[PDB]
Design a protein around this ligand. Sequence first.
Ligand SMILES: C/C=C/Cn1cc(-c2cccc(C(=O)N(C)C)c2)c2cc[nH]c2c1=O
Length: 126
Amino acid sequence: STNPPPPETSNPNKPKRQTNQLQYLLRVVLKTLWKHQFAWPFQQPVDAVKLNLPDYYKIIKTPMDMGTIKKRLENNYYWNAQECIQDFNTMFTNCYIYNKPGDDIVLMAEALEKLFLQKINELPTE
Ligand SMILES: C/C=C/Cn1cc(-c2cccc(C(=O)N(C)C)c2)c2cc[nH]c2c1=O
């Protein structure tokens, strides 16, 4: 049993960019979520092998985690803020799809998502 290769955090063939919105996503949004008490299970890809979740990557085909997002932001991997927002939304959605409603990990994701939405509500223009 193995985990898939993690999502790429850079790619020489994908145009790269920095915008004030992407700077906000790294400096304000990611930072705020990263330090939350519930953040640690989301700071790296799910190790389905060590967690003994053999069906995890049979079900979740678009994995995403905040460690990947952090590195993408640091590497200027994204062209725009929408791409990064989509990664956050993919992470939350994956958690709601794989896990039973009311599971602790779901409650943790829900708290992180509420904070995410509060922070992105003030995403600056441009
Ligand atoms: C990238 C984030 C994915 C979210 N996620 C994380 C873990 C997980 C990851 C690492 C550690 C732990 C853990 O040991 N906990 C929460 C006690 C859980 C887990 C265990 C069952 N379902 C999930 C799950 O959906």
